[PDB]
Amino acid sequence: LLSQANEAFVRNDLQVAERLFNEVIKKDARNFAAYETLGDIYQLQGRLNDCCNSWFLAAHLNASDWEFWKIVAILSADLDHVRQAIYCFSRVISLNPMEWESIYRRSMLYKKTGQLARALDGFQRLYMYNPYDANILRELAILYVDYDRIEDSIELYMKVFNANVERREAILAALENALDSSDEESMFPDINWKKIDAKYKCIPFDWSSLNILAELFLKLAVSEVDGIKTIKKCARWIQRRESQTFWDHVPDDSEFDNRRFKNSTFDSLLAAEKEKSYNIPIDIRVRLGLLRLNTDNLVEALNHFQCLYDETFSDVADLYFEAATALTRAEKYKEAIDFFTPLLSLEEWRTTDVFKPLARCYKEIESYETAKEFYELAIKSEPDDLDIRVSLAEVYYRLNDPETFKHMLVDVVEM
């Protein structure tokens, strides 16, 4: 009777006679080739769900054949069948705890679902077994952030930083010893560098990594000074100025600014250490501004923000906003308005997000006449918020027009 399998499968190669497999399955489902082929066939006929189904049940008779369960998993995943994918993957990993694609996708799906721990175990294991992959680091860091565990997330990057430092020092020491020792002779030591490149194979620590680190430091909001110091240090290891230790002992944030010219130890340096990159990317400077703002150091923060004017506006309109908001949150309105106002130039930024805080800023300054405007613009584009109406209502009260104020409140209380 089994022959009917073979007779069919070969003769079903072309067309719908394949759906006569469905007669072969009825007598006994336990045969694999039937389901597997049925899946192979549905995969070809175009219909995906029936296929995925066939493959799933197919998978269940060769339990521990995880190379198949993986396929079922990814297929289920692409079909937006999450729990199926997670389940199949989970078994694939239960059987083979060293399939990183599966663990990755599964952990991503866990991250999606909300089971952050289950994802975190995976990403931990993944990073552990592959510390030279930036995306894994990013994701694991993000997970650590979502877990209110920023410290680990920061240590994660500081490790990479220190690794880069070690690498640099190793290279320099190597070529130094080689060069100096050689120069005593005429030749040059046959020294191995692949050993150097391997033994010190860190993830490259560039400005992006530092920006991420900065963001992580902002998200921390605890002992921001140490953060700023670290940012400056790493930013100073970049630009190859780590030799300059004294910058660690100045709070002025004098470096990365012209003020450095007024420093005593600086002027004493050789022009070789000078003429080096002292300028940082704006993406980081702003964050230093914010991190400075966190410490009620408005002066430096503003000195950092003031560098936004020099940059081409459109390329950093996103940062003006952040800078503007942080100032409102910092009860610094007179300064916030200066960074809110330029956004009005671009149409895309004419939204409530910019109109509320502006209005509040002008409200708090006791220049209500101009706050009224933006509150009206905020409500206009677009309705509605209770609090905004109440704010505008403040404006009307403090404008000695409580009648209107009240009528507004009573107008909005209804809906």
Author numbering: 131 to 316, 337 to 565
Paste lines from the article:
Recruitment of Pol III to these genes requires the essential transcription factors TFIIIB and TFIIIC2. The six subunits of yeast TFIIIC are partitioned into two DNA-binding subcomplexes (τA and τB). The binding of these intragenic promoters by TFIIIC permits the assembly of TFIIIB, upstream of the transcription start site, which subsequently leads to the recruitment of Pol III, the formation of a PIC and finally to transcription. A genetic study suggests that the two largest TFIIIC subunits, τ138 and τ131, are responsible for connecting τA and τB16.
